[model samples]
Each structure stands twice: as structure tokens, then as C-alpha cells.
Target: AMQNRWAETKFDSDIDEVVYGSRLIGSDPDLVLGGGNTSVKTTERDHAGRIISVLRVKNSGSNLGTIDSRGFTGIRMDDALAAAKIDKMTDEAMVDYLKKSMVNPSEPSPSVETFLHAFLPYKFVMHSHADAILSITNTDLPSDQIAKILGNVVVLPYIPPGFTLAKEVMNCFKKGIDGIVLRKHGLLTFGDTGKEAYDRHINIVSRAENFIR
Candidate 1:
């Protein structure tokens, strides 16, 4: 609703404000090993009521803990989803694909997993490489423990990140899904609101912590 300048206000979309990325840095160095990422999708409609969807994802090389508007890279949702629809993609290919869809040419590049957010069905998505999460997921009996706490969790093998990981998750994602449990990777949860996804992130951690009992 308020606009001063791109430097003062990087994103005007309401969904951009919905994106709250944090890394828990300094306090927990272990958690900093593999940073997490978050994003929110927003749509704008012209006077004619046509819809224009764009996503605000964390900028590459930015830490979630202290991320601000500048820390995010804006890209077209349509472009990202279309790229995700690709059958196969390499890192180089994914990068090129994202660069072409950036909403602003001057904005820094978006995160590598930008396509993953597009592939999912939600306005807000949170991904964390939590140590607590990785502990059980990397174990042999990861399934039983994961099932006991997070019901209907989509458990996945540790596939390489980027397009491959997103592709694998897309294959299993469907309605009535709680979140994703990646073996030896991290936890991902998404919802219509940032709080929903953030709550799920904490809930899963506690569930994982309690399950050890």
C-alpha cells in the first residue's frame, strides 16, 4: 500500500510480506550448517481482473536469519512452475530457466529451489535443514518414527537437491499431505499462510524431539 523506492520497499506484494525466512544463526551454529529457505506467492490483478502471479524467494547467498526484502529475489510463478514441469533438468539448466523469469532484471537471482516452491500447492513454503530432523530421517527405521509423529508425511529418499529433488517430491505430493520428510536432508512444510507453515516447522521439531522418548 505504501511505495517509496525499490531500495526502501523491494516488494509490494502482500505475499512478499508473508515470506518470513530465518536461520537461527549465532544461537545455533549447527543449524547454520545447511541454511533453510522460505517463500510466499502473491497475485496481482489489473483493472480488468486479470491475474498475475509472482513469487518472492530468498536470494542466493543470503542467510534466512537476517533476510530482509533485499534478501529475496522475485520471479514469475508461471515460469517457475513451467520449469518444474520439465522432465529432466541440470543445475546449469535450472539457473538459466530462472534467470529468464525474474520479475525485475536488476533483482538478484532467486534460490536454487525456486522451482520446488512453484511445484507445490501453497502460498507459503518453509524448508529447514534442521539437525533434529536429519537425525531420525537418516536412520534405518526412519519411517516408523516419522509416521508416529507426523501423520501422512510424505517420506522421500535423499535425492540430489535442485530440480531432481523437486521432481521427486512433485511425483508424490497430493492433497491431504502434512509435509515432506526427506531422508538425510531436511523438513518442508507449506500452507496458505506463513504462520501455518511456521507452526508446522516447530510442531514437527517437537514431534521429532518427543518421539525419541
Candidate 2:
């Protein structure tokens, strides 16, 4: 099961790479300058003799298409998981906490939703704030529309991003879920691979775009 569950060491072709590239742009339609982020986890080993996954996340305020491997700031997975458990932190406090725990002090800080992406049990995660979906979700009957359209997804009400939002997501996981739709905020999706995560995101937006019209 472990072997079947594990991601391949080497990507077979360029398709994976292309999908990764496209989704970075496709995910965010609402953000005019900079407001969304995407990440792909690459395997690594830490000094403590433990296998770790290093996230190659888009830097805060970065344009996704131009992001290269070096754009990612190395963050310890365990530290990210721990951060997801804390309660009572303002967004500023969470950013400070994450900065202190990051592996690369020189790199720019991560997105506010960093902990939410880190807490998911997937190698790839994407978060976005598309206009069409946000238009419907930002309404008063968001839960009803969401329940009617996107069944069984992990829908989270608008919580300012960072540690507080992460803690809420962790709490929601106790009930078992797949994706998250942040009311008045944005969308979140995760999968074992970049393509899967990207596709799920496309599927979600496509469905909402069709339904709301």
C-alpha cells in the first residue's frame, strides 16, 4: 500500500510540468495584482534523519507563471503541522511565528494560508480567489448554495487567513473532508499530485460557474 500510495521519484513526462504551470495562472482570476498562491511538495531529508517534504510555494505577492523552483522558501513540515494547531494568533503573529520557524530565513515570507496548505495530507495544494465563485460564495446564502452545488466539500466560513484559519481547518478535519471553500474569501483543493489538485480546482470552479449562471 505504501508503494502504491507514494508519488513517483521521477516525473515521466512534461505533462506534469505543464499542468503545474497552467494551474498557477488558472487558479486565480480575481486577484488583480497579487492575492493567491500555489504549492508543490518535493521530497527531501532533514538533518534529523527524517524524511520531509519541502514545499515549493509561490512567494507572497508573486506572479505564478514566473515562479521557479528557487521561488519556494524551505519550511519544515513538522513545524507547519504544529502551527496548524495553535489558536489565538492574529495574522501578523502567525506570519511572525512562521518566519521564525522557516528553514530559509533569507527567503520572503509565505502566503497567509500557508498553514492550511501545509496541514493537508497531500503533496500538492492550491488556493485561489476566483471572481465567479467568490461572487456566489460571498452572498448571504453561501452555505445553501455550496451545499446544493458542491456536495461534501470542506466548506469553511470566512476566517482571516493564517494560524487562526489553520486551526479552524484542523478542527474541521476531525469530521473528514476533501476540499475547502472559504466564504467571502476563496477556494482550496488538495491531491496526491499537482495535476490532480489542479484538476479538482478546475472542476470546482467550472461547476460553480455553470450553476450560478
Candidate 3:
């Protein structure tokens, strides 16, 4: 029943994505009211020999726990990566650029940090602005505090999401970094599979939860 276990774990990961996304919104309604996103990459390759189609689930307004498979926009990873490299464009311009670059150009636009998910080599990625992590990172403490606590996690200073943040994260990956914590924003974790990435997210948040408790 290994396949069964894998299916169960992936379902649980999606549930956790919805639950945690709503939980963060519930815990801190003001700062993270709506519009957070999560994604899990797959190893299934398309006919082009490039990785395509990530299962990306995002909330449009305020709800979180109600996403479904159709809710996920199947985006081509290569298009997302290429859009991440475009420089010196207005937000509108960048958005337009990405819109044009997408294989499914008519699909819903992904969260600004979709590039971050695409840039990493992992098969799964989750991001959220949990209150606890945000509280610690937003403080004036040395930024390295993140690295000290998370160990090997890539800690990125605040960069507005979109092309700027995408480019910054691209640079970090080029330098061999993996996990990332966007200062004043959120936490990101990835792994070989959906469950591993989700577990890493839970582990990191559990550490932060304990630190606050």
C-alpha cells in the first residue's frame, strides 16, 4: 500500500496547506487577511522534456480551506523562470510579461512569489506569513537570527514581491542556498515530495511555536 500511503500523505499536505493558510489568517486577521498561496511541484515531465504543471493552490479573497485540484493553476515552470529574470519593469509590465510568457496564459495569475517556488529544485514548496515567524523576523534582531534558528535556511531581507524578490531569490539559489525566509514576509520550505516539504514546514513552525510559547 505504498502508493496508498503516498496518496494519503499528499491529500494531507493539501489539507494542511488549506488549514495552515486559514489558521494564519485567523490568528492574525489584519496582516494576512487573504491571498496567500501554496504549491507542490511534480516530477512528471511534459513532452518538451522540461518540468511543467505545478499544483498551485491560492485564495482569491478571504477563504483558504476550500481549495480543490481545479483551484490549482497548472503552470509551466520554464515560463515562470524566464519571467523571473526580466529586469527593470513596472509591476504592470512584469505582470504582463509573465502573462504573455505562460503556456496557459489564460490561467489565473499566480502569486507574485511563484517564481521563488519555480527557482528552487525541490518537488514541493510551501509559503505562508505565519504570525509567529513574522513577529520574530520583523524585529530589529540581526537577520542572521533566522539562519541560527533554522540552520541552512536561506534568509532573504525584505524585497517587495514580484520581479525584485524573484531575482533576489534566483541569486541566492545560484549561490547554492535552498530554504528561504523572506524578512517581514513569510517562510518557505521545499523537499523531494509533498509530504517532506510539508513536514519541514510543520517542523519549522513548531520550533517557532515553541519559541513563542
Candidate 4:
């Protein structure tokens, strides 16, 4: 039972931190795409009858660097997590028919990667199509090259996004993990808080940038 919903709920200020981080990361064209997205999850249970486990993910097609809180759509953790059980689905199948994916029916569609963000269960999940990182991954024989720059970060083979990719990420978490590098894609970092997540992303990208030189 959630004892204090408000206490568990996400703060407006927390959302603002997400926005700030997005802008900072977005400043570099190589760091985020107009399609890149980020998210944070919050939880609470309380006497005020306000209990929740919700994920706020950047809306589909929303530009991460420039998006405000409105760019994120809130969805109950239950529905979002349910996506993990699904073995297969296309992006179109997800957004076209999944009403439960959005907390508000009127809100814009959640990102195709919402399930990826929610399944992670981290307080903050930061992902970007970082230029330097992708530049390395785009090369032939990238695994060892990636390890040279990102020593401990987990590497994900080129799994297309949607359920397949999320399942692979879930598998990585089984062994315990920190950051992740998606080959031919980008990077992902998660933490107990927004700043930690954001910092990990920046530090990793910096390392990749240095390696490129």
C-alpha cells in the first residue's frame, strides 16, 4: 500500500530538471535527435488517495532538446510495464491501438520507446542519439572499440527498437548494470535521480568524444 501518494508523486521541479537536461544534451546535434526522447518515473502511496507509479516519457515526434513538460506524456506504470510481456509489436501497433499507453486520452501519443523507459524502473532514464558514440558504433568491428572508450557500460547489439530491444535491455539488467550503448543507435544511462542519470550520460559522451580524437 502506498502510504503517502504526494510524497511518492513526481515533483514539478523534477520535471523541470528533465527539461533542463534535455536542452543541455540537445545543444549538440550529435547528442540528441529531434526524435530522441528521455523520461523519469515516480511513485507514491498515501492517505490523500493519491497513489501512483507513473512514467513520463517524451511524446512521439517531440524534440527532446526543446520539449517542455508537455512533451512528455504520463502513463500508469501498470500498462507501460505490461508491454514487456508482449513478445512482438511494431511501432505502429503500439501507438495506433494502445489506449492505455497514455494517462490522458487527449495527451499526445507516447514515444515508441515508452515501454523501454518504463520497463527500466529507474527514477531517471536518459537516452540520446549522441554523435560521438554513434560514430564509433557505426564502424565495422565496434565491440572492442566501444569497450576501449566505455569500459564498463553494457553494449547492446543492433536490435531494432520496440519489444525486441526492450527485452535485450531487460536481460542486461538481470546481471546488474549502469549505462548502455546501443550499437548503431545511441546511449542510455539510468540513475536513482535525474542529475545522476544526466551526469552519467554526459561523462560517457565526453569519453567517447575524447576517444574520437
RMSD of 1: 7.0
> Please, what is the whole-model Cα lDDT of each candidate in the order they appear?
0.70, 0.65, 0.59, 0.73
Tens digit per residue, CA lDDT, model 1, 1-213: 111111223535554454342433212443446467788888755335767787888777557766667877777887887776578888998998889988776888888888767778888887878676788777677575676666667788788888889988777788877688887888888887765666666667657755554
TM-score versus the correct structure, for each prediction: 0.82, 0.79, 0.73, 0.84
- Across 89-128, the per-residue lDDT of candidate 2 in tens digits comes to 8877877877876677788777667777777777777777
Q: Write down the lDDT that model 3 would get.
A: 0.59
Which regions of candidate 2 are displaced past 4 Å?
1-33, 46-51, 174-178
Best prediction by lDDT: 4
lDDT of 1 at 109: 82
Q: Give stretches of model 1 more than 4 Å off.
A: 1-16, 19-34, 44-51, 142-144
Where does candidate 2 have its weakest 10-residue lDDT segment?
A: 1-10
TM-score of 2: 0.79
TM-score-better candidate, 3 vs 4? 4
Compose the digit string of candidate 3's lDDT tens values, residues 10-77: 33454344444334333433223454566665434554776655445342433444555444555566
Query: Which stretches of model 3 miss by more than 4 angstroms?
Result: 1-7, 10-33, 43-63, 174-178
- C-alpha root-mean-square deviation, each candidate: 7.0, 6.2, 6.1, 7.2
| Rank order (by lDDT, best first) | 4, 1, 2, 3
Whose TM-score is higher: candidate 1's or candidate 2's?
1
Give the TM-score comparing model 3 with the true structure, all chains together: 0.73
Answer with 1 or 3, whichever has the higher TM-score: 1
